[PDB]
Design an enzyme around this catalytic site. Structure first.
Site, short mmCIF file in Angstrom:
data_model
loop_
_atom_site.label_atom_id
_atom_site.label_comp_id
_atom_site.label_asym_id
_atom_site.label_seq_id
_atom_site.Cartn_x
_atom_site.Cartn_y
_atom_site.Cartn_z
N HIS A 1 0.83 -1.22 0.00
CA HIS A 1 0.00 0.00 0.00
C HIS A 1 0.86 1.26 0.00
CE1 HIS A 1 0.09 -0.39 4.58
NE2 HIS A 1 0.34 0.90 4.44
N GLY B 1 3.25 5.32 10.62
CA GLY B 1 4.60 5.12 10.11
C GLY B 1 5.27 3.82 10.51
N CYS C 1 4.21 1.02 9.64
CA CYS C 1 3.98 0.09 8.54
C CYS C 1 5.30 -0.39 7.98
CB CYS C 1 3.15 0.73 7.41
SG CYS C 1 1.51 1.14 7.97
#
Lengths: 301, 301
Positions: free
Chosen positions: A41, A138, A140
């Site tokens: 993503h 953040g 991720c």
């Protein structure tokens, strides 16, 4: 002695954490050999990632390895992760594997922001394929892992927070844990259960550490336990569970089914103000291996 | 979201962990620049370590840095730690400091055996200058630390287990935490207390994470709190404590003295089967800084 929620030393993984930017999205990537793995993503602009990815070129991906730019010479999608081929092999690449863990298994998380490692904590894959993690915007792309002698077994990449505040992500081939997707839906964690085999391993850890209260004279068959376990939203205890607890049964000389009888009474009566291993709750995030490791001496490097 | 007993990434410290052997004693040492620090009870043969150390020569100290021998070209004693000058500066030497922590402050432990890092966990210096650690035989010399941007602040070296299973050690200048000595005496931990300021920081962490139950309409003066705190074996809450909780008070809009009133009621009524942040106990091993760090985003490298 003592018992602590221990995480694996994180250095081998810190050496692989990079920053991946494309568009206005920045997240963490995992740099092994000449590939940088990261959640897909990060791709620009209800998605259809094959569409969006053909729309893109290497030079769109800014990969920061510390102070050093990293040149992306190729990309490709593997389920929900992006593989970004870069021109440099990570000299700090540890011996590693991509492995998928079972619910009830534990791993260490190296929480990262902007490719900079922030903290390390231990956690388990809940039976509903979520993890109760600690993540901020953040994080991720932060990975979970175990270490076995020198080998880093990567098992988790972090993708998203679910409305209850628990966390969902994938293995390192991009396949999600649980029925979750990397798009905005109404998805929620299903109802969780308590990892019975782990609670028993933890009780053995308490016994090994002198906490012998909870024990009792009684015993119980496996069937009669599970009848009471199910009532308290505990996973079923299998014969394989009982065998895996064997060594801990040996080391303490409390038969597995005896410890189940203590657990049975703990569930039925509560703890009455006492605590086990510094906890007023039955802890289900230590596996039989974790207990043995933290009560025998085993190292890694 | 989520809240976890987080430890600092440990790589910078793993690069400094070595093995120190002399005689039949093996323990862990800390290799910074061209010095290897380790506990002095590695010295051979009721002790008088100045005697025993003049009895010794460099070549008695076998220092293993991975697969590489390390040649000791000088030694010296600094309180309860040995400084072993070696001929090689540790190329992986991070920017570092030796700092001494206050009770109530937290740090990360990199538990080590034979210079090989085993695990990493977070803990606090108890008000009685012990730590509730997780250590097995051979963990001697494992260090505790914090990380601030890129700087490793070494605060702890592990020396011994006390009869209650808690742990005692020194700062990196060799001065013990608490009234403990590195010889066989009847020494015991004095009675501990609960770190009130930390419990309040943890309650703010629960509020930040949606756990808003425990809160209440009431309030309390600082004096009236401490009168109830002392009764439950809690450290006194000082004005400086209240100021350090300020930012967390701001972020949640619950005044510090209001949160104290909730704590007051929690102490007086217990939790009635509920839990806070996954715990059925009031947790005192998160400082105000730890909470902010894990609820704002701050990284290190």
């Amino acid at each position: 002695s003592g018992f602590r929620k221990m995480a694996f030393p994180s250095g081998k993984v810190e050496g692989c954490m990079v920053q991946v930017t494309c568009g206005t999205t920045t997240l963490n990537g995992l740099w092994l050999d000449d590939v940088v793995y990261c959640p897909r993503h990060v791709i620009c602009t209800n998605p259809n990632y094959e569409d969006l990815l053909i729309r893109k070129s290497n030079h769109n991906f800014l990969v920061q390895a510390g102070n050093v730019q990293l040149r992306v010479i190729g990309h490709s999608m593997q389920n929900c992760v992006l593989k970004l081929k870069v021109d440099t092999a990570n000299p700090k690449t540890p011996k590693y594997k991509f492995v998928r863990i079972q619910p009830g298994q534990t791993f260490s998380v190296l929480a990262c922001y902007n490719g900079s490692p922030s903290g390390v904590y231990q956690c388990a894959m809940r039976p509903n394929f979520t993890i109760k993690g600690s993540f901020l915007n953040g994080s991720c792309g932060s990975v979970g892992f175990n270490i076995d002698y020198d080998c880093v077994s990567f098992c988790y990449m972090h993708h998203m927070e679910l409305p209850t505040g628990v966390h969902a992500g994938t293995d390192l081939e991009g396949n999600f844990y649980g029925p979750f997707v990397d798009r905005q839906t109404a998805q929620a964690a299903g109802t969780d259960t308590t990892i019975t085999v782990n609670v028993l391993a933890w009780l053995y850890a308490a016994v090994i550490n002198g906490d012998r209260w909870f024990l009792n004279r009684f015993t119980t068959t496996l069937n009669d336990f599970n009848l009471v376990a199910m009532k308290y939203n505990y996973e079923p205890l299998t014969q394989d569970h009982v065998d895996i607890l064997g060594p801990l049964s040996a080391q303490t000389g409390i038969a597995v089914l005896d410890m189940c009888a203590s657990l049975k009474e703990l569930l039925q009566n509560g703890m009455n103000g006492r605590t086990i291993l510094g906890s007023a709750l039955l802890e289900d995030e230590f596996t039989p291996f974790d207990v043995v490791r933290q009560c025998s001496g085993v190292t890694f490097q």
